[PDB]
């Protein structure tokens, strides 16, 4: 059936502990406000040195380090290579984004919220996407002191994880609640401890 | 740094002289949508949803990698054979869920700041090498053009468990053992 594409790379000018020589090519697409602001940046990288790039905002290949003038000047002289790279803003970025609307951007994994111990740890695990709001409430009062939160933890399996800690001195009748808001949740999850 | 609501890498293309070896993958919002098995010429999507509704021709990946092989040789010569610099990777071990005895869980070993992308990530159970129930992500790209890779250890939490993530990399003097604190 029909297949999506990636960035087609340009060919370099040449004709034709253990040491290692590494090459990377990154066809990168940036999206903002849906399909209202799209930007293509293809990156040519030797080891860790990005030496030549195409920026759709610029429209031509540009050299980044003294290693890229021969590549950038040659790719810009090839009319079809330059035109096809510009058109990848449509054939790659804008096209594949429409397939993300059908799949990735509709993926909703509800988070699992648990509390355990003084210090109270609210574990918010296995959620997607990466937009989340975790707040501690003591007797219907949002805690705003002594709340240390770990950074957003990427599990690498299309789920995220975050742990919010609350240093609390428990008292008679004190009910502590972890509030979690997430796009997959019509109402925020509230978990009490007391 | 480009600010955007979503970032996709429709083409993380990798090729290196050691091996030699390569990698082709697409990423969206920092996660791997698929990689292409260059030896078996197969696209391997990472979610069931992708396997049912998304399609990518492996020949496009094989062709791009062949260009990378040619571009690498050219820039090796242009740079006076300037070799890659070995970075020191940083290793972090944590669990996917809060750990409860008898409830099957997963240990996650994040190996960050990898370069060159040649690494050996293995697990140890009480000093014994774990060879089964282990999986791994591809090399995932970073904006500084290094990589990170995540290894998964499925385990049944028990009282007498000692798990370590052993990482071997040229940037390390010795193999790095990262013991998992039960937390």
């Amino acid at each position, epitope marked *: *059936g*029909q*297949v*999506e*594409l990636g960035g*087609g790379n*340009a*060919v370099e000018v040449c*004709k*034709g502990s253990p040491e290692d020589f590494v090459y990377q090519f990154k066809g990168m697409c940036y999206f903002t406000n849906g399909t209202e602001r799209v930007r293509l940046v293809t990156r040519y990288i030797y080891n860790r040195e990005e030496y030549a790039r195409f920026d759709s905002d610029v429209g031509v290949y540009r050299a980044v380090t003294p290693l890229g003038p021969p590549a950038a000047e040659y790719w810009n002289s*090839q009319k*079809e*290579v330059l035109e*096809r790279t510009r*058109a990848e803003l*449509d*054939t*790659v970025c*804008r*096209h594949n984004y*429409q397939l993300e609307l059908r799949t990735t951007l509709q993926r909703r994994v509800e988070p699992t919220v648990t509390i355990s111990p003084n210090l109270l740890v609210c574990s918010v695990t296995d959620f997607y996407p990466a937009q989340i709001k975790v707040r501690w409430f003591r007797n219907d009062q949002e805690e705003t002191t002594g709340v240390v939160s770990t950074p957003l933890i990427r599990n690498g399996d299309w789920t995220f994880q975050i742990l919010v800690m609350l240093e609390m001195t428990p008292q008679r009748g004190d009910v502590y609640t972890c509030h979690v808001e997430h796009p997959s949740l019509q109402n925020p999850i509230i978990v009490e401890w007391r | 740094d480009i600010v955007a609501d979503h970032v996709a890498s429709y083409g993380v293309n990798l090729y290196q002289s050691y091996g030699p070896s390569g990698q082709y993958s697409h990423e969206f919002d920092g996660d791997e949508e698929f990689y292409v098995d260059l030896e078996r010429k197969e696209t391997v999507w990472q979610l069931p949803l992708f396997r049912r509704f998304r*399609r990518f*021709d492996p*020949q*496009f990946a*094989l*062709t791009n990698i*062949a*260009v990378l*092989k*040619h571009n690498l040789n050219c820039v090796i010569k242009r740079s006076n054979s300037t070799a890659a610099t070995n970075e020191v990777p940083e290793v972090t071990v944590f669990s996917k869920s809060p750990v409860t005895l008898g409830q099957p869980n997963t240990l996650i070993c994040l190996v960050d700041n990898i370069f060159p992308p040649v690494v050996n990530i293995t697990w140890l159970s009480n000093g014994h090498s774990v060879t089964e129930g282990v999986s791994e992500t591809s090399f995932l790209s970073k904006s500084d053009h290094s990589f990170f890779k995540i290894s998964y250890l499925t385990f049944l939490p028990s009282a007498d468990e000692i798990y370590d993530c052993k990482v071997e990399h040229w940037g390390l003097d010795e193999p790095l053992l990262k013991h998992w604190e039960p937390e």
Partner: T-cell receptor
Amino acid sequence: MKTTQPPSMDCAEGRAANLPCNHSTISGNEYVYWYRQIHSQGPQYIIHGLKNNETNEMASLIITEDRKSSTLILPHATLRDTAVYYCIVRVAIEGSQGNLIFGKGTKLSVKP
Amino acid sequence: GVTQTPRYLIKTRGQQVTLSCSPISGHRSVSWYQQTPGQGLQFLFEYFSETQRNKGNFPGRFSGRQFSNSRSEMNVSTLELGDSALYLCASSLRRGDTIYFGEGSWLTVVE
């Protein structure tokens, strides 16, 4: 194949030829290519386009807004333009990604 | 442009034929086609970096090869009368760029 064309078409010499092509199942990552073949010669590339209109020394290419059809405009048709004109969608399909599959085309006869 | 030899060939049934193609200078992708009055212009196979990529629907008798200089050869084994055709070679700068055809090799298989 994704393109259909009228089998034959006549054009008066010195007029412009407007050869139509339909391709409703075209994808957003597929280009439209036009070739021709005079007699027993190798096929000749004419022009290609994605969405915009294109013009080179040989012809213009008009792709409709919905991209479901296109038209090749040959200016000042001469006897040397008598050929079979092939409208080809360079498909993005598994196992044939980037292929140029030739159809029956349009036999253009430039009448003096 | 694309150079193709031999221009005209005469073979008998059961023989083999090798067709040579020199792409446009700098071009690295090469594609082969067979043109008959019956089947029309039919795609054989495509080469880049010395390896076959996309392939048409022809039997194993039709094989090809590409050298490190991007020149390509094509071979037909156990020739049949229906193999008489125009055999066209086309090249493009990269795989996926505009392909430009040569003039072809005219093969006649005779009894």
